[PDB]
Amino acid sequence: VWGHTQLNRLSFLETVPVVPLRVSDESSEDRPTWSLPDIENVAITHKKPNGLVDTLAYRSVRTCRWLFDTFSLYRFGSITESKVISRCLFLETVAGVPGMVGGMLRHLSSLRYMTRDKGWINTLLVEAENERMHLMTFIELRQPGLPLRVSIIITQAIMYLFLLVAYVISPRFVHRFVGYLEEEAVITYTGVMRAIDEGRLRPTKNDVPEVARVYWNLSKNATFRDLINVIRADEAEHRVVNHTFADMHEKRLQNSVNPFVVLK
Amino acid sequence: VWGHTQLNRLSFLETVPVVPLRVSDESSEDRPTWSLPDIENVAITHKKPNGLVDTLAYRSVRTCRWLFDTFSLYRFGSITESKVISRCLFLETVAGVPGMVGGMLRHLSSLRYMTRDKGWINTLLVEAENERMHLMTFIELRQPGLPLRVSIIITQAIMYLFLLVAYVISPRFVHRFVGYLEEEAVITYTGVMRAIDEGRLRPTKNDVPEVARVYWNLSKNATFRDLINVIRADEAEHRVVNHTFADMHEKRLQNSVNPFVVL
Ligand SMILES: CC(C)=CCC/C(C)=C/CC/C(C)=C/Cc1c(O)c2ccccc2oc1=O
Ligand SMILES: CC(C)=CCC/C(C)=C/CC/C(C)=C/Cc1c(O)c2ccccc2oc1=O
Ligand SMILES: [Fe+3]
Ligand SMILES: [Fe+3]
Ligand SMILES: [Fe+3]
Ligand SMILES: [Fe+3]
Ligand SMILES: [O-]
């Protein structure tokens, strides 16, 4: 029921105070679809940096981890729900940035050179959305203080700008920087799940929020452990995909077709 | 198949040579789905300015029209198929910016304020994608010279700048601005149909490009007129959407649900 009569209306303002808020609208219809026994066997992997830019990309992520794990006491003391969710609530505010600068910029280019993009943009945006559904999820399990919020705001100002210019200078540097961040994120989310398997972390949030149960399509009886498992598997897809784009840059392939649009 | 053994692979660089260049993968799977008999009756509306910000929007769009229509010599002489494609080519580059910058700025806003967007982001990113498809479609009908290629590149620089600062400063203003640009879009586009029906324009490009076919799900028999039909339907949507989104801002409803997700 979207046709010429609706296309000729000036505005549908007047219909806002009667539309349901619905958790399944918060994203596109392009949802991850995982099966837990399968993605159960996601694994920690490392790709060798293959020259200066890769090495410089890796040294950066590795530098930031050591830095980030230390100014946020993440090794000091036992693992906890509070510290884990707090970590991921923050780190996901940054994860949602690179895909939107990457998607924007290729869009921006495509229009000003009138070229095809051959599938890249789309992958890049729904990654960025996916990463933000990780946050929409986490922000429901824990609300943060003025400190952590302010500190989040100041971060985006920094990571947005850096990724903006990094992507203009060298897309290859950015796609390898995210690829390596995802290695670190499949290590974190594996450490969280391991801990659950080994009793060291007894999750309490085992009510998976509504945003999350529809987005990944989890059963009503899904545990916090199941939520980490699927989040984890999105980070691995990101891992393979950005590394593949990084690689494609390296080999003069930024204007060949996005291999993942078929491989879907 | 998409599972762990793929997610556990390090790169799919070896595959790129064998993955074909299908034209459906140029856009997302969120395609428009019009009915030519229906969208044939899409018409020309005009949202009334409220105050300063709406007027500003409106005087911006009219002065920019008057400028562009005289610098490009659109109104000088008889309409031709060429000066039609040429004009859309140019203007469709601009068209793709606003939705992507809103989308981006609202994405960033949901990221940092950890708030729920409620469906705005992906409507503006499809808007963005959709205009970009307009462009891709005309790039089949006319591959332009360097003078236009230059004009388009500087014209992005400025516009990106203008729409970025403006959208941070007053997203209401931007969405209105858009409404009016899309009003004009439809005037121009119904004119081109009028002028086809009256045989003052002979659509010599009736081999409607493959891209557009799979995008707008048109049959092989579809013509230029039918192509312009769906395209101008698209603009009529962006016309409403953007006047609604600005209305919502005017009322302080920026953080309320995107009506159009639940139509
Ligand atoms: C505040 C500022 C100026 C810059 C922020 C620095 C920054 C990007 C730090 C993160 C780099 C890092 C240690 C990554 C590790 C990591 C993740 O990125 C991550 C992302 C999502 C989910 C779980 C994650 O777990 C991690 O250990
Ligand atoms: C070069 C520069 C700094 C700014 C460009 C100014 C500018 C955007 C002018 C366009 C205003 C205008 C004439 C609107 C009419 C119009 C469209 O917007 C339009 C959009 C999509 C498809 C067809 C269109 O046809 C139009 O006539
Ligand atoms: Fe994440
Ligand atoms: Fe990530
Ligand atoms: Fe358009
Ligand atoms: Fe338009
Ligand atoms: O992430």
> For residue A8, what are its two tokens?
């000729």
Query: Residue B54 C-alpha to ligand 2 middle, in angstroms?
Result: 18
The answer to whether the beta carbons of residues A99 and A128 sit under 8 Å apart is yes
Task: Tell which residue, A103, A94, A107, has the closest CA to residue A124.
Answer: A103
Task: Tell which residue, A104, A126, A7, has the closest CA to residue B96.
Answer: A104
Ion ligand 5 contact residues with beta carbon within 5 A: B 95, 131, 134
CA distances from A58 to A49, A178, A220 (A): 7, 10, 40
Ligand 1 pocket test: which of A63, A65, A91 has the largest number of ligand atoms within 8 Å of its C-beta? A91
**Inter-chain residue contact B7 with A236, CB threshold 8 Å:** yes
Domain residue limits at A64: 1-264
Residues in CB range of A45: below 8 A, 6 or more apart = A183, A186, A239, B8, B10
User: Rounded to an integer, what is the distance from CA B17 to the centroid of its chain?
Assistant: 32
**Inter-chain residue contact B16 with A257, CB threshold 8 Å:** yes
Is B175 annotated in a binding site? The answer is no
Nearest residue, CB atoms, B43 vs list A8, A47, A236: A8
Task: Tell which residue, B109, B100, B97, has the closest CA to residue B160.
Answer: B97
Ligand 2 pocket test: which of B69, B135, B184 has the largest number of ligand atoms within 8 Å of its C-beta? B184
The answer to whether the beta carbons of residues A91 and A106 sit under 8 Å apart is no
Query: Residue B182 C-alpha to ligand 6 middle, in angstroms?
Result: 5
Is B29 annotated in a binding site? The answer is no
Tally of structural domains, chain A: 1
Phi, psi of A33 (to 5 degrees): -130, 95
CA distances from B111 to A126, A132, A225, B105, B227 (A): 14, 7, 24, 10, 38
Nearest residue, CB atoms, B9 vs list A160, A240, A262: A240
CA dihedral in degrees (A201, A204, A206, A212; nearest 10)? -90
Nearest residue, CB atoms, B47 vs list A10, A16, A247: A10
Burial A109-139 (b: 16+ CB within 10 A, else e): bbbbebebbbbbbbbbbbbbbbbbbbbbbbb
The answer to whether the beta carbons of residues B263 and A2 sit under 8 Å apart is yes
Phi, psi of B43 (to 5 degrees): -130, -170
Q: Alpha helices, DSSP H only, in chain B?
A: 4-7, 36-39, 52-71, 81-95, 97-113, 120-141, 146-169, 171-197, 210-215, 224-250
The answer to whether the beta carbons of residues B141 and B92 sit under 8 Å apart is no
Helix-helix angle B224-250:B120-141, to 10 degrees = 150
Block residue for tokens 């429901």: A140
The answer to whether the beta carbons of residues B243 and B235 sit under 8 Å apart is no
Method: X-ray
d(CA B122, CA B261): 10
Burial A18-52 (b: 16+ CB within 10 A, else e): ebeeebebbbbebbbebeeeebeebeebebebeee
> For residue A92, what are its two tokens?
């996901």
Secondary element (H or E) of residue A59:
helix A52-70
> For residue B243, what are its two tokens?
């006047």
Inform me whether the C-beta atom of residue A45 falls under 8 Å from chain B C-beta atoms.
yes
We report the CATH number of the domain holding residue B111 as 1.20.1260.140
Block residue for tokens 């959709």: B130
d(CA A172, CA B259): 39
CA atoms within 13 A of residue B109's CA, in its CB half-sphere: 16
DSSP A11: -
The answer to whether the beta carbons of residues A121 and A259 sit under 8 Å apart is no
The data reach a resolution, in angstroms, of 2.7
Inform me whether the C-beta atom of residue A116 falls under 8 Å from chain B C-beta atoms.
yes
How many C-beta neighbours within 10 Å does residue A252 have?
8
CA distances from B208 to B45, B138, B205, B222, B224 (A): 28, 10, 7, 7, 6
Phi, psi of B49 (to 5 degrees): -60, 140
Residue ranges with strand state E in A30-89: none
d(CA A96, CA A159): 10
Phi, psi of B117 (to 5 degrees): -85, -40
Helix-helix angle B171-197:B81-95, to 10 degrees = 160
> For residue B84, what are its two tokens?
């039609």
Task: Tell which residue, A253, A243, A258, A234, has the closest CA to residue A27.
Answer: A234
Radius of gyration over alpha carbons of chain B, in Å?
20
Block residue for tokens 């970025």: B164
Which residues of B fall within a CB distance of 8 Å from A85?
A: none
Measured in angstroms, the CA of B261 and the nearest CA of chain A are apart by 7
Question: What's the distance, Cα to Cα, between the start and end of chain A in Å?
Answer: 30
d(CA B140, CA B27): 16
> For residue A48, what are its two tokens?
């060798």
Report how many Cβ contacts below 8 Å link chain A to chain B.
234
The answer to whether the beta carbons of residues B25 and B141 sit under 8 Å apart is no
The answer to whether the beta carbons of residues A92 and A134 sit under 8 Å apart is yes
Task: Tell which residue, B84, B211, B19, B226, has the closest CA to residue A114.
Answer: B211
Q: Is A185 in the pocket of ligand 1 (CB under 6 A)?
A: yes
Classify B256 in phi/psi space as left (phi over 0), alpha (psi -120 to 50) or beta.
beta
d(CA A181, CA A202): 27
